[PDB]
Design an enzyme around this catalytic site. Structure first.
Site, short mmCIF file in Angstrom:
data_model
loop_
_atom_site.label_atom_id
_atom_site.label_comp_id
_atom_site.label_asym_id
_atom_site.label_seq_id
_atom_site.Cartn_x
_atom_site.Cartn_y
_atom_site.Cartn_z
N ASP A 264 0.34 -28.07 20.01
CA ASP A 264 0.23 -27.50 18.72
C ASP A 264 -0.71 -28.22 17.74
O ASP A 264 -0.34 -28.39 16.56
CB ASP A 264 1.61 -27.32 18.05
CG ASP A 264 1.64 -26.10 17.07
OD1 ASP A 264 0.77 -25.16 17.08
OD2 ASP A 264 2.59 -26.11 16.25
N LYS B 178 -3.39 -28.56 15.18
CA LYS B 178 -4.11 -27.73 14.17
C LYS B 178 -4.05 -28.51 12.89
O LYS B 178 -3.23 -29.41 12.69
CB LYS B 178 -3.43 -26.38 14.02
CG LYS B 178 -1.95 -26.42 13.78
CD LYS B 178 -1.32 -25.04 13.64
CE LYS B 178 0.17 -25.08 13.30
NZ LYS B 178 0.71 -23.71 13.14
N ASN C 169 -0.75 -29.48 11.15
CA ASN C 169 0.13 -30.46 11.80
C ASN C 169 -0.54 -31.82 11.87
O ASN C 169 -0.02 -32.72 12.49
CB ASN C 169 0.42 -29.99 13.25
CG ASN C 169 1.40 -28.81 13.32
OD1 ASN C 169 2.12 -28.50 12.38
ND2 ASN C 169 1.47 -28.22 14.45
#
Ligand SMILES: COc1cc2c(cc1Nc1nc(Nc3ccsc3C(N)=O)c3cc[nH]c3n1)N(C(=O)CN(C)C)CCC2(C)C
Ligand SMILES: COc1cc2c(cc1Nc1nc(Nc3ccsc3C(N)=O)c3cc[nH]c3n1)N(C(=O)CN(C)C)CCC2(C)C
Ligand SMILES: [Cl-]
Ligand SMILES: [Cl-]
Ligand SMILES: [Cl-]
Ligand SMILES: [Cl-]
Ligand SMILES: [Cl-]
Ligand SMILES: [Cl-]
Ligand SMILES: [Cl-]
Ligand SMILES: [Cl-]
Ligand SMILES: [Cl-]
Ligand SMILES: [Cl-]
Ligand SMILES: [Cl-]
Ligand SMILES: [Cl-]
Lengths: 492, 492
Positions: A285, A287, A290
């Protein structure tokens, strides 16, 4: 900021209370004296008070100092090192070393000069000096600190002072450890909503990954505990919040980061990804939302809720997980995948940092997941003039739709990727130690935070989840906050 | 003054080397934490670092401070003590104490105010705080110092630098302990001349007495050892030499001490004699030539070569020993005698200090031992105007020819004698602690010192004699010279 009442529960125990730890702890040299900050500090204090070990300790320290020094100071440091410990007239000549080792360390000039010397120094320190340490007061004082580390430090020890955010992820608070004053982020998972959304196993998988990594480029887990209503993860607070906010919302007219700043974050994110991939974990995840920023200017990866640890002899996995816009073609097509997915997401993230838009979607454009998916699978990316040739080329290398052709993790490391011209001005050895000055320093955003029947299967899971205090972060906190210095005094 | 090479042999051992001492030492509270200077210092360091014991330690220290303070400061000290530890609002209120004990200590006004409080404080400290000390690092560090105390420290450790005197007593040198720089007097007994004059048993009796007394008013024995040629006793050096020299040879025209100076020496000699008599030892050779002076101005008794220790249920002895002019009638007549003999000699010594002649013989007069003996038995003493009424009266009381009528040791103490008006201006509690300023301060005379087949029965006696290091003086030396502070550091 320290609170008296909780500071007073940090008392070293009588020795007799440490006899059971003495049996059950792993007491290997690397694990105790090199990897645990209190172990190391106590080992070095033992060396410093035993004059025969003075040369080994000062050489140890001077090599670490050399390894993280500004480029312009390395000549003069490597000269002073050689004159103090290695030349035949040296006042602190290290006579435990081989004549060969001393020879090579006196020659040589490039990166990792003294890395072989350091191995020799640590090898020597792990023999008789370590055995003498185990028969010293310093080792017993280590057992006393380890007993303290193991005591109950649950919800009572933390004061919540600000809500950072609430959603499907739970609730995240800024909080303060009462005894030390150290600030942390605390993420709270409601036990009832968690059971009913059948999220036990996901939550456990996340906690486990966080507990087992230890990187300056990944948010650290310091405590895991339960309340009557919640499961709680106390972790590094990152005062700037996510970098997506900074790309768009700081210079609103001309959004995007300058390249040096983008490069520096990329380098830190790559260091984080390598740490995971070397442990066989796929993040899944990456991106901008984050990647979190602190007010020294450094970033960490966060939100490890989709991450997977690959099992023995496992090189690929399947499973549809990620964020639309950041998932690699191979994942979108339903194929098996590996660490390659995180490198595509890296490509996307760097693109956005520089362009203030993604590679497949204009700024503010609304695209349904189907139209986005087909763009990721079919559209060739274009690069505005805003991109330098090195940033374009790096991005192309990560955005390869075929993971076989994508740049990534090869031969157990990212060292291949580190050689790309994009990173020519990054000193990796200072980056790794937290000693490279960031090209940009932001302001803290903490003031934008606003103020404050279960089965026996549910019970056993909560208590397993609530594994308590993580040794390494706890030792760091104790040293950083001055508590270690204050309680470890022998004669005031 | 310290020498590197010997300082380097003072190294604390690994803990495992102390496991046998741990079994064999007496580890009672009074013996370890009150009577041994290193034990006490380490006990107090443990108290100081354990906040719950802060009040007991500060009260302990403040009572000792009160006990030795100048008379003019005692009101204000006893007020500050009461306000800190005893009154209901006291910041450091000592709640381990009885309400009665606190009550009495808040009332009262005379000498030995707080002596009952002190007993209560030490009684409390010998229970749980002492048990906690035994389970601490501080106790182990005490065992390490005790291991060091027990290591070989023979002739090599001392540098002889001046001859103080030679005669039938052997030879006495000024010497320096190489590791610490501490100056001592060393008395050397030639093994061959000793065997041939059959002096084994006398020498042993002297050494034993010196080892078992510990008084600031008696020369201390710090080390006993052998060489190939000699038996050696290392003891307090007294830089002024004997007081006889000072009576006559400093103001040659008008010899004698002023009364305050004479009184102060008498008080110190009485303190010395009480120490012996309380241990059932008769000195038998008190005279000015055996009372030594140091350059702070304090005196000690020396030359314990005629002293006797009385055996179980023994109250008297016989035996013709002493110096003509100082032996009491009862001894000269061949009767049994006790501690009374030393009080007659005291009388004679004080007489000489004030008159610069003895009570039975004019200055420089030559008298054979027979004519002297009959004078001691028959002549009534007269007192020039040089004597105050108090000094005359004290002298008369000690020069009583009948020991039944002589002032002396009664009911286990000299407290009777301490009440005589002669001593009205002496603060005994400061005298006992070395804290009373002498009325006179002399110069050092060290510069008047000039520069430098046996049977198996002989062997076993020499080695028994050579018992090595005496614990208490050795701990004193280590603390005084700064060695204790230097080697006991936990983190430089
Ligand atoms: C003073 O610190 C902050 C302030 C703010 C944020 C985050 C942080 N810091 C923070 N935030 C964290 N997580 C967080 C915060 C809001 S949602 C959220 C999450 N879902 O994990 C973590 C997890 C480990 N360490 C963390 N540090 N916010 C965000 O980063 C929002 N993005 C994640 C979408 C919320 C905004 C403010 C300024 C309050
Ligand atoms: C710097 O120190 C001194 C210097 C001198 C003397 C004594 C000392 N100090 C001294 N002298 C001692 N004994 C000594 C010295 C000469 S003989 C003698 C002895 N027979 O014990 C002792 C025993 C324990 N501690 C001692 N301290 N002298 C005398 O006191 C001589 N009377 C005993 C008779 C010798 C003179 C000088 C000034 C050298
Ligand atoms: Cl150190
Ligand atoms: Cl030690
Ligand atoms: Cl920027
Ligand atoms: Cl996009
Ligand atoms: Cl587009
Ligand atoms: Cl580098
Ligand atoms: Cl102290
Ligand atoms: Cl301790
Ligand atoms: Cl005088
Ligand atoms: Cl006389
Ligand atoms: Cl006469
Ligand atoms: Cl008094």
């Amino acid at each position: 900021s320290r609170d008296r009442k909780y500071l007073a529960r940090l008392k070293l125990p009588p020795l007799s209370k440490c006899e059971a730890l003495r049996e059950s702890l792993d007491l290997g040299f690397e694990g105790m004296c090199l990897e645990q900050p209190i172990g190391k500090r106590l080992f070095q204090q033992f060396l410093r008070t035993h004059e025969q070990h003075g040369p080994a300790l000062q050489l140890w320290k001077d090599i670490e100092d050399y390894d993280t020094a500004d480029d312009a100071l390395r000549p003069q440091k490597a000269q002073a090192l050689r004159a103090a410990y290695l030349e035949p007239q040296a006042q602190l000549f290290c006579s435990f070393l081989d004549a060969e080792t001393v020879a090579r360390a006196r020659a040589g000039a490039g990166d990792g000069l003294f890395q072989p010397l350091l191995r020799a120094v640590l090898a020597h320190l792990g023999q008789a000096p370590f055995q003498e340490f185990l028969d010293s007061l310093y080792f017993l004082r280590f057992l006393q600190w380890k007993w303290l580390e193991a005591q109950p430090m649950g919800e009572d020890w933390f004061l919540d002072f600000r809500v950072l955010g609430r959603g499907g992820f739970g609730e995240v608070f800024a909080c303060q450890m009462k005894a030390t004053g150290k600030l942390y982020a605390c993420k709270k998972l409601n036990k009832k909503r968690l059971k009913k959304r059948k999220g036990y196993q996901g939550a456990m998988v996340e906690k486990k990954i966080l507990a087992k990594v230890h990187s300056r480029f990944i948010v650290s887990l310091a405590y895991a505990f339960e309340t009557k209503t919640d499961l709680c993860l106390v972790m590094t607070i990152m005062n700037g919040g996510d970098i997506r906010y900074h790309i768009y919302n700081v210079d609103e007219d001309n959004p995007g980061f300058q390249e040096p700043r983008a490069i520096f974050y990329t380098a830190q994110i790559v260091s984080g990804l390598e740490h995971l991939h070397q442990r066989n974990i796929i993040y899944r995840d990456l991106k901008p939302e984050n990647v979190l920023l602190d007010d020294d200017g450094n970033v960490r990866i966060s939100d490890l809720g989709l991450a997977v640890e690959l099992k023995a002899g496992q090189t690929k996995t399947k499973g549809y997980a990620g964020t639309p816009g950041f998932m690699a073609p191979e994942l979108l097509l339903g194929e098996e995948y590996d660490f390659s997915v995180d490198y595509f997401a890296l490509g996307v993230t760097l693109y956005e940092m520089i362009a203030a838009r993604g590679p497949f979607r204009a700024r503010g454009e609304k695209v349904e997941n189907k139209e986005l998916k087909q763009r990721v699978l079919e559209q060739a990316v274009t690069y505005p003039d805003k991109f330098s040739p090195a940033s374009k080329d790096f991005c192309e290398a990560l955005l390869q739709k075929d993971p076989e052709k994508r740049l990534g993790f090869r031969d157990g490391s990212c060292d291949g990727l580190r050689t790309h011209p994009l990173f020519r001005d990054i000193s990796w050895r200072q980056l790794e130690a937290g000693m490279l000055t960031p090209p940009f320093v932001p302001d803290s955003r903490t003031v934008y935070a606003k103020n404050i029947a279960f089965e026996k299967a549910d019970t056993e899971f909560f208590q397993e989840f609530a594994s308590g205090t993580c040794p390494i972060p706890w030792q760091e906190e104790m040293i950083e906050t001055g508590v270690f210095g204050d309680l470890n005094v022998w004669r005031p």
